[PDB]
């Protein structure tokens, strides 16, 4: 039936910008230089995925096996899975560990003993463990041509980036080591190569007021340059061993009141476009690890109650999921290239059962499989044959309006077979059709 999520973690290391400035990002706890010994960056060590990883001694095979066995024993025995890689800049490491990690992670599916990543995926595509995608987190100065190619080779579908703010002074202050234009370039390259970007934003950064937050989020959700496909809300927390704790001890920094936070979250989640999903709303850190901040992790229901009391009703994808549905199409310009978003909406009770995203190749897209004059289907999803209908509409739009000759779709290695019943071939990691 449903798909069970599998989470992994990497080995501890140092973020790449420490060699130039001399310190890591201010608000980030944990790591090799913190009291949380043998814990990766941006993590304490007391979280489910975290202690499973640390008791696995950080090897993909063992922890994948534990997760799969536990989920199977629970009484589900799912068919598809989706990997998630967590913790630190995954491609700041030497390529040898990257290759070893990904190849062993893929081999842990059925049992092959691949010597290299190529044969690893070429054998994984023939498995019964229908893995549909892998997610990788990367910072903007390490999302470039080579890094994007490496992404595509491992067969990942979505990637996550942390911008956390749209003001240059905040980047200069918190010592991120990269200007805000890097976020623009990273979004441009990632979006014009078939990937689905989900971004990270935090309320209540240092030296950021309250009205400035709503203004920056309005700029975020209205400016074509900064429109993401997925929102990652993370309230700011103060945790020892970081520059933020040093500031907070001297009485400089301060945190929002509970009611102010509830109202701000309600306002932000009220202005989210219907085509944007909200992955995470709160941080996963337990109670006693954070000194000041939200001390209760049920922020979802409080925000929903505040919105209900307010007078605005959410249109997020998370709450708009499962008498006749109808095809609705939306358009907008994001990151410098015309897009389109098709769905099957039920405006009676305001839900949906099927959706699809399509985008025209903007210009000078380096990915040779595209080569210009093509279209990309960034995601398809079905709930519960609507999929072939959505593909029909997408083909019609590609042929008629875009004026394209070839079309391509990104798919996980476990589903590239499902696009063969339609008449697609394989070029690179894409399924390809001619118009």
């Amino acid at each position: 039936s449903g798909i069970a999520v599998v989470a992994v973690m990497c080995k501890p290391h140092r973020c790449p910008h420490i060699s130039f400035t001399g310190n890591i990002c201010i608000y980030c706890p944990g790591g090799p230089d913190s009291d949380f010994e043998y814990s990766t960056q941006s993590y304490t060590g007391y979280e489910p995925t975290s202690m499973r990883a640390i008791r696995a001694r950080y090897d993909p095979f063992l922890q994948t096996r534990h997760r799969i066995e536990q989920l199977k024993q629970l009484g589900h025995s799912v068919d598809k899975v989706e990997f998630i890689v967590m913790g630190g800049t995954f491609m700041a490491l030497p390529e040898e560990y990257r290759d070893y990690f990904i190849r062993s992670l893929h081999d842990a599916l059925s049992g092959h003993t691949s010597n290299n990543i190529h044969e690893a995926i070429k054998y994984s595509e023939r498995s019964f463990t229908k893995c549909v995608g892998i997610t990788i987190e990367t910072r903007p100065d390490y999302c470039m041509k080579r890094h994007l190619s490496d992404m595509l080779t491992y067969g990942c579908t979505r990637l996550e980036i942390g911008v956390q703010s749209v003001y240059e002074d905040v980047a200069r202050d918190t010592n991120r080591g990269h200007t805000v234009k890097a976020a623009c370039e990273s979004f441009h390259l990632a979006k014009d190569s078939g990937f689905k970007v989900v971004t990270h934003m935090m309320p209540d950064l240092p030296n950021v007021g309250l009205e400035r937050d709503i203004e920056q989020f309005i700029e975020f959700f209205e400016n074509p340059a900064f429109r993401p496909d997925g929102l990652k809300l993370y309230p700011t927390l103060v945790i020892r061993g970081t520059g933020l704790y040093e500031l907070w001890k001297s009485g400089r920094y301060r945190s929002y009141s509970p009611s102010d936070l509830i109202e701000l979250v309600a306002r932000i989640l009220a202005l989210v476009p219907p085509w944007t999903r909200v992955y995470r709303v709160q941080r996963d850190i337990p109670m006693p690890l954070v000194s000041s901040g939200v001390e209760h992790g049920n922020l979802r229901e409080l925000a929903f109650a505040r919105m209900k009391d307010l007078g605005i009703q959410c249109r997020d994808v998370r709450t708009r999921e499962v008498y006749q549905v109808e095809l609705v199409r939306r358009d907008y310009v994001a990151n410098g290239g015309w897009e389109t978003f098709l769905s099957y909406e039920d405006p009676d009770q305001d839900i949906l059962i099927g959706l699809l995203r399509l985008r025209k190749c903007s210009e000078e897209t380096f990915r040779f499989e595209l080569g210009g004059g093509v279209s990309i289907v960034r995601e398809l999803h079905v709930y519960g044959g609507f999929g072939m209908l959505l593909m029909e509409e997408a083909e019609r739009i590609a042929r008629e309006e875009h004026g394209s000759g070839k079309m391509a779709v990104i798919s996980g290695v476990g589903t590239r077979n499902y696009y063969r019943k339609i008449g697609y071939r394989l070029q690179g990691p894409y399924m390809v059709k001619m118009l």
């Binding site: 001694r57 003993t113 044969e119 023939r126």
Partner: protein, 694 residues
Amino acid sequence: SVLEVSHVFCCPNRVRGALSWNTGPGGLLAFGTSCSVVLYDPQKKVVITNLNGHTARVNCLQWIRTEDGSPSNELVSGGSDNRVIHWELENNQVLKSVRLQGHEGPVCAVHAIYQSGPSEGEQHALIASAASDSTVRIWSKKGSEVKYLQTLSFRDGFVLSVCLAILPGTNVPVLACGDDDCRIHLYIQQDDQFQKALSLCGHEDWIRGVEWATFGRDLFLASCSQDCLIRIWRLYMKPASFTTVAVTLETVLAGHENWVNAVHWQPSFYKDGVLQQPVRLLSASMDKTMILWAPDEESGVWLEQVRVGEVGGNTLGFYDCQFGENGTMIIAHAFHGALHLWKQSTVNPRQWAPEIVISGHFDGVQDLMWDPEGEFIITTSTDQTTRLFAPWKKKDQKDRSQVTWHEIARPQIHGYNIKCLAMIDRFQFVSGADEKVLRVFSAPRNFVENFSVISREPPTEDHLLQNTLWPEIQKLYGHGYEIVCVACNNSKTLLASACKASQKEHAAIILWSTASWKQVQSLAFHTLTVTQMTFSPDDKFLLAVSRDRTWSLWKRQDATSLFAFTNKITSVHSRIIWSCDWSPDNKYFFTGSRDKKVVVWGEPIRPCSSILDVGSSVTAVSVCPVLNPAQRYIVAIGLESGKICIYSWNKTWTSCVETNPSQSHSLGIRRLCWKSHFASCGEDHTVKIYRVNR
């Protein structure tokens, strides 16, 4: 002169079908390590020699079976260098290989068997191989020259081959390959072209194991898959007259409720003058359990007799199970790379058979150091563990001769990879792993009892996996980055550490106190990280060599007349320096860099004496402590390719140049430790003990 290898320590690769046991009397074991195949005699406890012929990892081994129940001593090995090789021994030393041509893909499993064609006088064997590009290819032998009979592109796309099995049915060769989804392909040749006889399909999931057998007139085909089912077909046929095959299905079992990586029958052995082949099926599942199936139990149920294995410790099971000479002892291959042997000993419930299985590192060995007096040896490797070997002098109650060597303890199971190591006491040692600190481990009192028991029974696998750890005592903060090289003092008073550095701020050598564990000095001259550095035999000097192609004799007051000396140089070498060594009389010191130019410097001015070029780059240099009356020196250098060269240096050619072994090391050497006889370690799981006699 002479150069004999006393002992080696190795470990099988993690492929499914890595080891194979010979049939009949005097069975023999052969498995694979990083780039080689290692032999092993179960009767004894010693390794004879390795078949160093490959360039990549070796993934399949198979004995060429001899029909008349006699030892064969010819085998086939397929590697990850796109190479299938046929080897002939007929003895304990004959190393003759054929080194067939490319397969275009790393093979996973192969097979071979004798044709049994007497009409053509002595008949020969044939080989069927499958690879990454989903093809099956036939290689035959008809004497000295190999025969490329035919090629068969098994499929075109990603329709792979899961296993392979060979046995002639009655008169003609028959091939049984595996198609991933559910299928088993049974082929047959007319004259030389193999044409598809039939394809069987009864498995819901991926098929993993396929095995032949013969009983009376009926062939037997055993198979095991991932669908919680073990599937057997008794089969009576006639060879294709153009006739076809007449397969029969039978009852199945409910074994292990998990994946089954391997399954096997029982071979035929010579006893009381006749050949016996019992009806036995033995599996190798993943739930750390193994079931001894029995034939029909006089009714057809085929129920077991005892299932060995406890689900407690390891849930990842095994990759192989094979027989001894007969139904006496059964061997299995663990997931992590260890072996497990069981013996019955005239009793129906079987028990373990320890003290026989050889064990070694399953990841590259980085460093080792000799015992202070010569009792044991300690090795560290990138498998996140440390291992301790010591010889067994408590040999059999009547056989006290031929002392062997066995691993004794697993002190630490760490969470990083270990890079540097030094010994500070008989029962204490310091290790620097990937962390920015150093750790110190000392022997407990629960170890010395068994140590004196065995070195004045060797531990089992479980005892090493659960109950051999050494408690930690110390922790050495003070570095910023990884630790690259450490040294030690003659009298166990001073330490010397160096951290992985890229600038001149972190390139500072740090000295410590053995008694108090406190930093007392910090020297800084080198522009980059110090790759190696060593004390002199006397405390008058301390030499260092770094990656900045320059050396430094930079020593100052310990502060715990001058009791040190300093001198440096601008540049002499052209590439990164690797090794530095001293002399027994402290009169000369030797440096060897990657540009394979070993240079001596004499004991102000520090000029050279002569330069020497070596066929390959150097990675380790050591000098024999024992002097010679003719005022000469002995150097034993270890190179990148896996070779050791012994030279004699004479004061002012006149330098000995010809002393080196063959079949020495597959991959790079890291260090060479003389005994105060020397030991060699490498990046290919190989640690060996040598001997020189002159």
